[PDB]
Each structure stands twice: as structure tokens, then as C-alpha cells.
Amino acid sequence: RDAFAALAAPENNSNPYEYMRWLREHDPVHRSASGIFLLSRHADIYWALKATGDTFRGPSAGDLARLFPRAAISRSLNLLASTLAMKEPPTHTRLRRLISRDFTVRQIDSLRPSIVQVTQTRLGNIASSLEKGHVVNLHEVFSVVLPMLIFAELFGMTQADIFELAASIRTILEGLNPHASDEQLAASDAASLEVERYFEGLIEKKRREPQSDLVSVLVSTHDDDDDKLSDTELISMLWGILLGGFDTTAAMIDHAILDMLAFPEQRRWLEGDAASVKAFIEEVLRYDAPAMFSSIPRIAQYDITIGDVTIPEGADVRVLLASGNRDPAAFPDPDRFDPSRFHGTAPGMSTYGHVLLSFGHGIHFCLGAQLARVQLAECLPVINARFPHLVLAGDPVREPSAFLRTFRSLPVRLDTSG
Numbered sequence: 001r002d003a004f005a006a007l008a009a010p011e012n013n014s015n016p017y018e019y020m021r022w023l024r025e026h027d028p029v030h031r032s033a034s035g036i037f038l039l040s041r042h043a044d045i046y047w048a049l050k051a052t053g054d055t056f057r058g059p060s061a062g063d064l065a066r067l068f069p070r071a072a073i074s075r076s077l078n079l080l081a082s083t084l085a086m087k088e089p090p091t092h093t094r095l096r097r098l099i100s101r102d103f104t105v106r107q108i109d110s111l112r113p114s115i116v117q118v119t120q121t122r123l124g125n126i127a128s129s130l131e132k133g134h135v136v137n138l139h140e141v142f143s144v145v146l147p148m149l150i151f152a153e154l155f156g157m158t159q160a161d162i163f164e165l166a167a168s169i170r171t172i173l174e175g176l177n178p179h180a181s182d183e184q185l186a187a188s189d190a191a192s193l194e195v196e197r198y199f200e201g202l203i204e205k206k207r208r209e210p211q212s213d214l215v216s217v218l219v220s221t222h223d224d225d226d227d228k229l230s231d232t233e234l235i236s237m238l239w240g241i242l243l244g245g246f247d248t249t250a251a252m253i254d255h256a257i258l259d260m261l262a263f264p265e266q267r268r269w270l271e272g273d274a275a276s277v278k279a280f281i282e283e284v285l286r287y288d289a290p291a292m293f294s295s296i297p298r299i300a301q302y303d304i305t306i307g308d309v310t311i312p313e314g315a316d317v318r319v320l321l322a323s324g325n326r327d328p329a330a331f332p333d334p335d336r337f338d339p340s341r342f343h344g345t346a347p348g349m350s351t352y353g354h355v356l357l358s359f360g361h362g363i364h365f366c367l368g369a370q371l372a373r374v375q376l377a378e379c380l381p382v383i384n385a386r387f388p389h390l391v392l393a394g395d396p397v398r399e400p401s402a403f404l405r406t407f408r409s410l411p412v413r414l415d416t417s418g
């Protein structure tokens with residue numbers, strides 16, 4: 001039984017956590033049919049994430065060629081290979097350093113007003129329909145929209161552009177699936193051309209007429225260090241930033257709305273102070289990792305042993321983040337949605353000192369973790385207040401993803417009771 005196929009099967013597509021429990025206890029260092037390993041326990045996942053750099057290296061040109069055989073020499077794989085997620089130290093260390101110099105907590109906090117503004121407008125667009133007793137696919141009208149509009153504000157782009165780029169991301173990703181046709185490959189390569197041309201023009205525009213967005217800050221001079229991302233590095237950083245926030249953030253919003261509706265007694269957390277709202281959102285992340293797996297390959301630098309299981313040099317190791325979040329050794333009563341686990345603590349850290357894994361750990365820790373958290377911290381209380389009697393209208397329809405717990409629809413309506 002291949003654990004990657006077992007987790008994509010329809011028998012475990014709705015609730016995969018019983019199978020994950022089985023893995024943790026019976027096959028915690030699972031070797032798949034492809035030879036790729038999958039770690040399901042919190043302890044082994046934590047170790048492997050923090051070892052990335054010493055025990056594990058990033059994917060080589062040969063690794064990516066094996067992982068993407070149909071796109072080995074494509075423009076699209078070359079663009080993905082250039083992203084921070086696919087790099088390793090010390091190159092990864094400079095690039096991370098340079099984007100975090102300007103992609104700061106202050107920068108992100110300055111987006112909170114836009115987050116509320118977008119949420120008010122989008123909810124206002126559907127207020128009448130909900131008031132008339134109708135059903136709304138909240139995923140399509142809100143969850144996918146808010147993250148892209150916030151990216152547009154962040155980068156200094158138009159709404160039209162970000163929605164066109166998202167489509168290009170869709171095409172490129174379809175072009176990199178292992179079963180992708182020649183036609184999808186060609187379509188992907190043209191889109192990659194499109195995306196590179198767009199960012200080159202966006203870079204040049206902000207350089208001559210800088211504004212207050214992140215791209216302007218990134219392309220202008222800095223007082224302290226004269227180091228900066230070259231144009232090629234900039235194109236790749238902005239592309240990878242968008243890829244990192246594509247689907248993931250929308251899924252996190254969907255999951256948070258679904259947790260509000262399934263556990264109405266927990267919506268009190270969204271009505272409290274900042275610390276209270278953050279606690280709810282941390283538990284949303286622990287209860288259902290929007291990203292089930294790691295997509296960053298982690299390659300053994302030598303013959304590794306976890307227990308008596310050998311992971312040979314050059315082997316690819318992935319981690320089941322969602323399973324570690326439900327590991328009772330790290331989170332007691334793991335199947336209970338309880339925001340108190342993270343009330344008053346540092347982000348991602350439980351009151352018992354255990355970290356949730358939804359964002360990773362170590363040197364590839366999600367660059368956008370704060371951006372995602374702030375988007376939910378601002379939009380969720382606004383949703384909860386505007387529609388107190390919001391209820392699930394039907395079963396959400398899950399969207400098949402290799403490693404994300406995405407939704408195609410999240411149908412909601414207002415409770416009709418005289």
C-alpha cells in the first residue's frame with residue numbers, strides 16, 4: 001500500500017487522520033513505491049525539518065529531472081528550480097536574507113486595513129443574496145479572492161494582473177504534473193514566458209516611479225547594505241512568493257470557516273482581543289493543515305537510520321505535516337478542536353511547548369506565515385460579525401490536490417427561522 005496513493009484515495013479523502021494514525025504507529029518511516037520516504041510522526045518530522053541543511057540537502061538538477069521527467073529542460077521547471085523553496089544554503093541563505101530585509105512584519109501589518117476593506121466589499125457583494133435565503137459558494141466568491149487581492153496590494157499590481165497571473169500559475173502547475181500532456185507542457189512554457197515578461201515590466205516600472213509597495217522597496221537602494229536581489233533573482237522571488245500563497249491561503253480560510261460552522265461554541269474566540277483571535281487561527285492550522293505534505297524535496301546526504309529503517313544516500317524524504325499536528329505525543333486529545341492550546345503563547349507554539357507543523361520548521365519555514373495569519377486574523381472576525389447566523393448549506397466539495405486539502409465549493413446560507 002503506497003501511502004501517497006492511500007492518502008489520495010476516495011476512502012481517505014474526506015478524513016485521512018485515521019490512516020495517518022495507522023502510519024504513525026505501524027509504518028512511521030514509510031517507503032513509498034517510488035522509493036520516496038514519508039515521515040508521519042511529529043518527532044521525526046520535527047527532526048527532519050530542523051536538520052535540513054546538515055543531514056539533508058536540497059534537490060539537485062538530477063533530482064528535479066527525476067521528479068519532473070516530462071519537464072526536465074522546460075522553462076517552467078527552470079523557474080521553479082530558481083525559487084527559494086528549491087534552493088539550499090548558502091545560496092538559500094542570501095536570498096532569504098534579502099527578501100526578509102524588506103518583506104517585514106511592519107510591511108505585513110500595514111496590509112491589515114486592506115484586508116478588512118476587501119472583506120467588507122466582498123461580503124457586501126453577497127449580503128443581499130444571503131439575506132434573500134439563497135446559498136453562496138463562499139470559497140469561490142471570497143476564499144480564493146482575498147489572498148490574491150492582498151498580493152496585488154502587496155506587490156503594487158492591478159486586480160486584473162493578479163487574476164491573470166493566478167491563471168498562469170494554474171497553467172504552469174498543470175504543466176508540471178507527471179501525467180501532463182505535451183499540450184499542457186507547451187501551454188506551461190508560454191505562461192512562464194508570460195510571467196517573466198510581466199515581472200520584468202513590473203520591476204522596470206517601480207524602478208523609475210517607486211511607490212510604497214514591496215516591489216518598489218525591493219528594487220530601490222538600501223542604506224545599510226549594497227547587496228540586493230538582481231532582476232533575475234527578483235523575478236524568481238516574486239514568482240515563488242505567489243506560488244507559496246496560491247491555494248494554501250484560500251484553503252486555510254475555507255478550513256477556518258468550516259471550523260467556525262462545525263464548532264459554533266468556539267466562535268467566541270473570534271470576538272475577543274487580538275490574542276484570542278490568534279488562538280483560534282493557530283488551532284485551525286493544527287486541526288487541518290491546509291498543506292498536508294511538504295513539496296520541498298529533502299535529499300539524504302548519507303545513509304540515514306530512523307530506528308532500524310535505513311534511508312540511503314540520495315533518497316527523497318517528505319513529511320506528513322498534518323499527521324504530526326495530530327500526534328498525541330505533541331498534542332494531547334489531538335482530535336479535539338481547542339483554541340486554548342495556543343492562547344497567549346508565541347505563534348505556532350502550544351502551552352506545553354510543542355510546535356504545530358503547518359508552516360514547516362527550520363530554514364525553509366514558510367516565508368508567508370505571518371502574512372497568512374494576519375489575513376485570517378482580520379477577515380474572520382469580520383465574517384463572524386457580519387453574518388452571525390451563517391450556517392453550512394451543504395457538504396463542501398473537495399478539490400483533488402496532490403498535497404493540499406483544498407475545496408471547490410464551501411456552500412453557506414443564513415439560518416431561516418422566523
Ligand code: HEM
Nearest residue numbers: 084085244245248249252294296359360364366367368372
Ligand atoms: C495557509 C497558508 C500557507 C501555508 C499552510 C504554507 C505552508 C508552507 C510550508 C509548510 C512551507 C515549508 C515546506 C517545507 O519546508 O517542506 C512553506 C514555504 C514557503 N512559503 Fe508558505 N504557506 C502558506 C502561505 C504562504 C504565503 C501567503 C506566502 C507568501 C510569501 C508563502 C511563501 C512561502 C515561501 C517563499 C516558502 C519557501 C521558504 C523557503 O524555502 O525558505 N506561503 N509554506
